[PDB]
């Protein structure tokens, strides 16, 4: 069977602020 | 916002689209203006490009620093055997353009000109103008009634001429066919001249003179799909560019929200139809003349062909026209020469040229000798000599 | 004919590597019947399996 | 349609000019099969093992500029062979394989 997990997390940078 | 530093655009918008030409012949869009006063004569010619060589001559240009001094210039030779006239076509002026009205062919057409009407000659019955030739019959009423209509109605008369390919060294056996406009004389004299010249040849010396200025039309050398940097000369991106650096960075703004025709994009480079202008003739040689390459100041019996033959062409054995510089096209290709469309009175146009020496060292390398007799004198006997 | 096991046994019996053992290409049907180390030891005598010579490494230039 | 044998010379320089080094000897094999077809009209061409050694004598990228060959057109004895005839190429042992022109070899 196929176990699954959180795909990527992080590596999305940051925005506006 | 506005671009920070200005600069001219890359490329010319008058030469769009940059696509392959429809035919290997570049077509003569415009012929010289007519005046009925002079004699009948052709306005263009057909030839085959051969190669290039070098010329040394004096300069007759009062005022310039090099007046009465030697100068070395480049020239390109065009193999031009005589052309054969095989028909006449008449054009009427209509409110929505010119329009052909009749084509009258000759009786006997050579094999190499009727190869132009077959794709698979080797398995054909050679049925071409077979029924048309039975029109001359015993009287020729049909043919002479057709010519009557051209004299009556046509305002522009042209002539169909096919080049004698078999004489040139090309492996091709099919002969080109193109239309040349007749200038000079009444509409009556024009169609008579064509009829007398059916199956007859027209040599190059009867069209061009030595110091004329002419225009060349031919299809340029092809290269295939090409990137932006060598199709439009765009700047290259810095070294540290992800996803390539031979690309145009910005291909437009957010709005209009469509890529504009003015942007540089990759695609076909080469194989276009071009019309260069203002080329001065330097020699009108004769095929059956030895010492085609000699001059008043040289005086050595040698022909125009370098040692070992023009690379990728062969040897010249017919008439030829050498012009100052480059003409569009690559070697071996059909090239059509035209008379200029205006009277050029500049000093360059009127200058008369007398050559001093034509080059014949081999173009297949760093040639050192001009004649095989010159090689033997310098080197002396070798082992392979008797 | 699949004579892979015959090379293996031949190498140990003749006492060399598999790169140094020769099997006669015209005696396939004979070698195929040799499933014992006795049989391989009898073909070596016959000449159906021969020991290839060692490649030369001459010390002359040295 | 006839049993005929002949001797040729093949200029392998002009056929391997520009070819990648790891593919010079293999491609020469293919060109001797193309050459035998052009002259004998047999789709089935069998190269002798001794010819294979002549080609591969100097590694992948050491093919000889010219090779003298013997092409023999023969009959197919095999049942249900697609083609009645087939060719067979062998090497010819000579000091220098240049300066020679094609010539027929008599059966006996």
């Amino acid at each position: 069977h196929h176990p699954r997990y959180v795909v990527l997390a992080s590596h999305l940078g940051r925005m506006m602020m | 916002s506005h671009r920070k530093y200005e600069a001219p655009r890359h490329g010319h918008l008058g030469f769009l689209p940059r696509k392959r030409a429809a035919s290997i012949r570049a077509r003569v869009k415009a012929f010289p203006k007519d005046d009925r006063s002079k004699p009948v004569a052709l306005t263009s010619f057909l030839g085959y490009k051969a190669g290039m060589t070098t010329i040394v001559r004096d300069l007759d240009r009062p005022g310039s620093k090099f007046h009465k001094r030697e100068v070395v210039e480049a020239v390109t030779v065009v193999d031009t055997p005589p052309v054969v006239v095989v028909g006449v076509v008449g054009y009427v002026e209509t409110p929505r353009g010119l329009r052909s009205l009749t084509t009258v062919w000759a009786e006997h057409l050579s094999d190499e000109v009727k190869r132009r009407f077959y794709k698979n000659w080797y398995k054909s019955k050679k049925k071409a103008f077979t029924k048309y030739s039975a029109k001359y019959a015993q009287d020729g009423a049909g043919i002479e009634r057709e010519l009557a209509r051209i004299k009556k109605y046509a305002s522009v008369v042209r002539v169909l001429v096919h080049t004698q390919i078999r004489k040139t060294p090309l492996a091709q056996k099919k002969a080109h066919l193109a239309e040349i406009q007749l200038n000079g004389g009444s509409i009556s004299e024009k169609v008579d001249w064509a009829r007398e010249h059916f199956e007859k040849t027209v040599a190059v010396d009867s069209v061009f003179e030595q110091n004329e200025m002419i225009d060349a039309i031919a299809v340029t050398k092809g290269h295939g799909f090409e990137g932006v940097t060598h199709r439009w000369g765009t700047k290259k991106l810095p070294r540290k560019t992800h996803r390539g650096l031979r690309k145009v960075a910005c291909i437009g703004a957010w709005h209009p929200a469509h890529v504009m025709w003015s942007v540089a994009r990759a695609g076909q480079r080469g194989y276009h139809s071009r019309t260069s202008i203002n080329h001065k003739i330097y020699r009108v040689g004769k095929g059956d003349d030895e010492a085609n390459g000699a001059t008043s100041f040289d005086r050595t019996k040698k022909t125009i062909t370098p040692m070992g033959g023009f690379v990728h062409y062969g040897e010249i054995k017919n008439d030829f026209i050498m012009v100052k510089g480059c003409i569009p096209g690559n070697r071996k290709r059909i090239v059509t020469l035209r008379k200029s469309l205006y009277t050029n009175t500049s000093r360059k146009a009127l200058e008369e040229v007398s050559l001093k020496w034509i080059d014949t060292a081999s173009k297949f390398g760093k040639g050192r000798f001009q004649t095989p007799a010159e090689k033997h004198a310098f080197m002396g006997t070798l082992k392979k000599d008797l | 004919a699949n004579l892979r096991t015959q090379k293996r046994l031949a190498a140990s019996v003749v006492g060399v590597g598999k790169r140094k053992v020769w099997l006669d290409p015209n005696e396939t049907s004979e070698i195929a019947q040799a499933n014992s180390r006795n049989a391989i030891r009898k073909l070596v005598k016959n000449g159906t399996i021969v020991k290839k010579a060692v490649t030369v490494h001459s010390k002359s230039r040295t | 349609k006839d049993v005929v044998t002949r001797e040729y010379t093949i200029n392998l320089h002009k056929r391997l000019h520009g070819v990648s080094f790891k593919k010079r000897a293999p491609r020469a094999v293919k060109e001797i099969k193309k050459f035998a077809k052009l002259h004998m009209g047999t789709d089935d061409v069998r190269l002798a093992p001794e010819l294979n050694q002549a080609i591969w004598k100097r590694g992948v990228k050491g093919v000889e500029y010219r090779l003298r060959l013997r092409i023999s057109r023969k009959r197919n004895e095999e049942e249900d062979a697609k083609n009645p005839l087939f060719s067979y190429v062998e090497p010819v042992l000579v000091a220098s394989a240049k300066g020679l022109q094609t010539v027929v070899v008599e059966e006996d």
Partner: protein
């Protein structure tokens, strides 16, 4: 033993079929459509030439992003290919169909492919491994194939309806008038 829609006389046909065959369904459909309606002799020379690479199968529906070729000209198409593996299967079933026809006594010359169809079969499934430890599928696509060959015939239609005309009273008065004026 039940086939698809057909309209030919069963007494003059012989059929063959094969099921659960591991060959691409998209390729095999193009192969079958190219033989549809041909005479049996012509189709079998045609397929042999596709293997020999002299002719090509015109690709019509399953043809997105494939290459162009000069051998689609005759079929009116610019994209075509040479499905080797799918030609062998269709080639095998035509041979079976010819064998059945001679068992029934049909005349081997008039046969033609009056029916051929391909539809999907249960998948065969596997696993592929992707970056970041993700599993996906790597399935196949088998196909069912069937066909029928029939004797050609010559039309013998006849005995059609007369289509009697029903005249009104006003019309019959006119027609009677025309008769009296002239014969």
């Amino acid at each position: 033993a039940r086939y698809g829609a057909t309209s030919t006389n069963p007494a003059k046909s012989a059929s063959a079929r094969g099921s659960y065959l591991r060959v691409s369904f998209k390729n095999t459909r193009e192969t079958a459509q190219a033989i549809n309606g041909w005479e049996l002799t012509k189709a079998q020379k045609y397929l042999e030439q596709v293997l020999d690479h002299q002719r090509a199968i015109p690709f019509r529906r399953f043809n997105s992003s494939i290459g162009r070729t000069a051998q689609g000209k005759e079929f009116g198409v610019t994209k075509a290919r040479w499905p080797a593996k799918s030609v062998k299967f269709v080639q095998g079933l035509l041979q079976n169909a010819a064998a059945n026809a001679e068992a029934k006594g049909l005349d081997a010359t008039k046969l033609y492919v009056s029916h051929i169809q391909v539809n999907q079969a249960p998948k065969q499934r596997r696993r592929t491994y992707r970056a970041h430890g993700r599993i996906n599928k790597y399935e196949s696509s088998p196909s069912h194939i069937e066909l029928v060959v029939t004797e050609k015939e010559e039309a013998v239609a006849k005995a059609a309806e007369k289509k009697v005309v029903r005249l009104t009273s006003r019309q019959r008065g006119r027609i009677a008038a025309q008769k009296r004026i002239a014969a």
